[PDB]
Amino acid sequence: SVSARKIKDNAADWHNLILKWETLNDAGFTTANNIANLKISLLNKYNEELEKLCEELQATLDGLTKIQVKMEKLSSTTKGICELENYHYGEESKRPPLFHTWPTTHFYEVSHKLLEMYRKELLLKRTVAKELAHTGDPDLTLSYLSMWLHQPYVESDSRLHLESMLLETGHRAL
C-alpha cells in the first residue's frame, strides 16, 4: 500500500500533464497562425503588436517548460522504487507482489520513453519559436506551422502504452 499510492499518483499525473500539454499547444498554434498572417500582411504591402505576440508565445513556452520539469520529477521518483525494492528484496525474490503481473522495470521503460519524446519535442518547439518571425519564404512558414501542429517526435504507440498503465492502475474500470 506504500508503493500503491505513489503508482496511482503518477498515473494521474501523467494523464493530466498530457492534457495540459495539448491545451497549451492549441493556444500556441492560434498565436503562431496570427503572427504568420501579420508578417505576410506586411510583406504583401507594428513592432508593438509583433513584440506582444512574441511575448505571449514565450509565455506559452515557459508554461511548457514547467510541464517538462514536472515530467523530470516523475521519472526520478519511479527510478527509486526500482533500486530500493530490487536491492532489499535482493534476489531470492523472483516473486515481486505488484498489482497484477508487472515488475517495476516496465514502469521505468514507459516513463523513460515518454520523457525522451517530450524532451525532444520541446527543443523542436524552441527552434520554431526562434526562427518563425524572421523568415520570408512561405514554404518554410508552412513547414514551421506543420511542425507545430503535427508534432513529429511523438509516437502514437506510446499513447497506447499509457493506456497499459491505466489498465495497470485501476482508475479506469476493467
Binding site: 509583433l50 512574441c54 514565450q58 526562427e131 518563425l132 518571425a133 524572421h134
Partner: peptide, 26 residues
C-alpha cells in the same frame, strides 16, 4: 546582457566602457 530581438535570444559580453567624465576601464 540579454535581449530578445523579435523572439530571438541574444547574449552579449561587456569588454570596455568609457563614460562622460573621461575614464576608460579595461
Amino acid at each position: 546582457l540579454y535581449c530578445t530581438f523579435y523572439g530571438r535570444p541574444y547574449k552579449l559580453q561587456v569588454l570596455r566602457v568609457k563614460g562622460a567624465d573621461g575614464m576608460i576601464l579595461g
